[PDB]
């Protein structure tokens, strides 16, 4: 198997309800009908996890070596941003939202004749 595949972004024209585009609930007060609060989550690794610290990287003959990023208490510091982007893209997929990051992609790509 090629190590990547794609989940289809179905077009969303004429979608309605909470899966559709809608005015955001906002931050001014807690809405009587909508849920708020704290979720506690456990994350356990299955294959090894890379958390490379680009601040401590070392360069020899233009090759870069990365250590693991560690926190002030010396344990591996898994950034919340890395978890957030994991969840965000996984959330966009199963919810089928808009894609958050599309670069311009406005040039015609090129190929070669056989």
């Amino acid at each position: 198997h090629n190590p990547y595949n794609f989940v289809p972004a179905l077009p969303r024209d004429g979608i309605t309800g909470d899966l559709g585009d809608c005015a955001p609930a906002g931050h001014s007060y807690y809405h009587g009908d909508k849920y708020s609060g704290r979720i506690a989550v456990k994350l356990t690794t299955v294959t090894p996890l890379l958390i490379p610290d680009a601040s401590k990287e070392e360069i020899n003959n233009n090759h870069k070596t990365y250590p693991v990023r560690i926190g002030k208490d010396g344990k591996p510091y898994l950034p919340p941003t890395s978890i957030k982007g994991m969840l965000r893209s996984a959330y966009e997929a199963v919810t089928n939202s808009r894609l958050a990051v599309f670069e311009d992609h406005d040039s015609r790509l090129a190929y070669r004749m056989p």
Binding site: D53, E57, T81, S89, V101, E103
Partner: protein, 518 residues
């Protein structure tokens, strides 16, 4: 002339205990709000501005009694009184060595979207903490001795109970007096009139007057929150850096720079949660209101204050504005760096190169980067394009995360006298405002109020270890507040007291009137 039994020259050093701002006419191309400068362009405290701060405090001391205040500060109306007996000169501000005027950025955050409101971006020049200026008072006594209210004033200055200039509730303006000196000239007599002309006066021991009075501090509730960052806490600097795009804000504090969370920022997060609680209880939506109307809701108008706004509300013309009874100080890091040591961080250009020496310097581990990066740690981030993976073209950025900077306890000062004046004296009416404040502090200790930049993006969550409540002269039914709390859920406050506050609070929830409406 005006008969004078004795002229007292009362002088010493005033020090800025937090950054000052006395405003000029305003605007200066460098900042929106610009410091007052004298005719030589030197920064100064106008004697009008200082004289009014002193007269103001005496008026709060003498319970807004006019009769005695006019006998010191003079009057225009009464046929007997006229010119002021206290004279206050202009005083030039001497900023510390190498230090310079700082610019503080400000933003207003839309209460609905949680993002900066349109047009609500501003910046303020401030005199750094530890700047000095001369106390320049003269008093022309027509009676013998020295007025006790004028002695209480000088005791209040030495206690640092007077605030001067703008943004007094949002970090700025505290001053404290040092080196008080009193020179008496007995201008009523030949030996005294020549002393004024030649001999430079008669010394008085301040400690001898300071012994004949008890300093009556007004009602207040001091709140000290002891906390540490659970995720890196910072306020972002004013603009992007070289090796690091996002750098923490720092301020001069005498010889050293320290990381700072402005009181503006801590006030703003507290206000936001206070409003959300009130609007939640009432289910009052915030979305259709513009930002100046979003801010304006009950109890918070008294605690955090409201903008001046004249209204012909009932043919009668009234001002809606009132100052915040709640004031917040700037919170500085325990860690400190020499000013050039941080200038080495601001001007690093290679994250793996010359930045590494600079952070080893500033973190205090000049030979041990693996300890240096347990204090300030550079982080890299990418935006990952959703079709291709990899990274979106251009979307690479880095943060200097103060993962391990330790922070001093936050000081919140609640002016119980100012609320009690808003409620026309009725201490029953304090309990909803005190109840709200304790609910805000309950959330702060439960990680419900993150602080600073990037709160949704891996920063800003604080652990609160201890809240110390230390009020002075509190009314007897609020006297149970004087406590040190370590349970986040306030269970260290007496249940009878928490149950009393809950009752007055619930009775306000059942009818959320404008509580200062007499």
């Amino acid at each position: 002339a005006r008969k004078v039994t004795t002229r007292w020259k009362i002088t010493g050093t005033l020090i800025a205990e937090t950054p000052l701002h006395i405003g000029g006419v305003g605007g200066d191309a460098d900042t929106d709000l610009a410091l007052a400068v004298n005719g030589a362009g030197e920064y100064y405290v106008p004697g009008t501005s200082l004289a009014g701060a002193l007269r103001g405090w005496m008026t709060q001391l003498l319970n807004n009694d006019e009769s005695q205040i006019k006998d010191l500060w003079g009057d225009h109306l009464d046929a007997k009184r006229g010119a002021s007996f206290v004279i206050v000169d202009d005083a030039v501000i001497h900023i510390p060595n190498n230090a310079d005027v700082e610019i503080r950025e400000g933003v207003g955050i839309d209460r609905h979207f949680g993002t900066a409101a349109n047009g609500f971006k501003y910046s303020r020049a401030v005199i750094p903490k530890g700047s000095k200026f001369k106390l320049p008072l003269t008093f022309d006594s027509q009676d013998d001795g020295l007025p006790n209210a004028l002695i209480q004033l000088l005791c209040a200055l030495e206690a640092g109970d007077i605030r001067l200039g703008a943004a007094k509730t949002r970090g700025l303006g505290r001053i404290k007096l040092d080196d008080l000196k009193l020179k008496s000239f007995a201008l009523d007599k030949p030996e005294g009139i020549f002393s004024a002309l030649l001999d430079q006066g008669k010394k008085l021991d301040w400690n001898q007057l300071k012994a004949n009075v008890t300093y009556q501090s007004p009602p207040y509730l001091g709140i000290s929150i002891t906390w540490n960052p659970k995720d890196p806490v910072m306020v972002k600097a004013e603009g992007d850096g070289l090796a690091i795009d996002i750098l923490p804000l720092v301020s001069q504090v005498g010889s050293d720079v320290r990381f700072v969370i402005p009181g503006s920022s801590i006030k703003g997060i507290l206000r936001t949660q206070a409003e959300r609680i009130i609007r939640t209880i009432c289910q009052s939506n915030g979305s259709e209101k513009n930002f100046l109307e979003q801010l304006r809701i009950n109890l918070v108008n008294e605690l955090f204050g409201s903008a001046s706004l004249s209204q012909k509300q009932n043919g009668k013309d009234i001002d809606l504005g009132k100052i915040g009874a709640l004031a917040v100080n700037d919170c500085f890091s325990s860690l400190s760096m020499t000013p050039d040591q941080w200038k080495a961080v601001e001007n690093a250009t290679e994250m793996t190169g010359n930045l590494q020496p600079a952070l080893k310097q500033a973190t205090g581990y000049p030979n041990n980067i693996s300890q240096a990066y347990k204090v300030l740690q550079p982080a890299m981030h990418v935006a990952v394009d959703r079709w291709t993976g990899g990274a979106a073209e251009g979307m690479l950025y880095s943060v200097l995360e103060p993962i391990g900077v330790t922070w001093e306890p936050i000081q919140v000062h609640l002016d119980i006298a100012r609320l009690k004046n808003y409620y026309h004296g009725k201490e029953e009416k304090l309990k909803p405002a005190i109840a709200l404040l304790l609910l805000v502090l309950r959330d702060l200790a439960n990680k419900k109020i993150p602080v600073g930049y990037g709160t949704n993006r891996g920063m800003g969550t604080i652990t609160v270890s201890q809240i110390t409540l230390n009020g002075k002269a509190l009314p007897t039914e609020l006297e149970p507040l004087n406590k040190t709390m370590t349970c986040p859920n306030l269970t260290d406050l007496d249940e009878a007291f928490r149950q009393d506050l809950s009752t007055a609070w619930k009775e306000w929830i059942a009818d959320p009137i404008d509580l200062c409406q007499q």
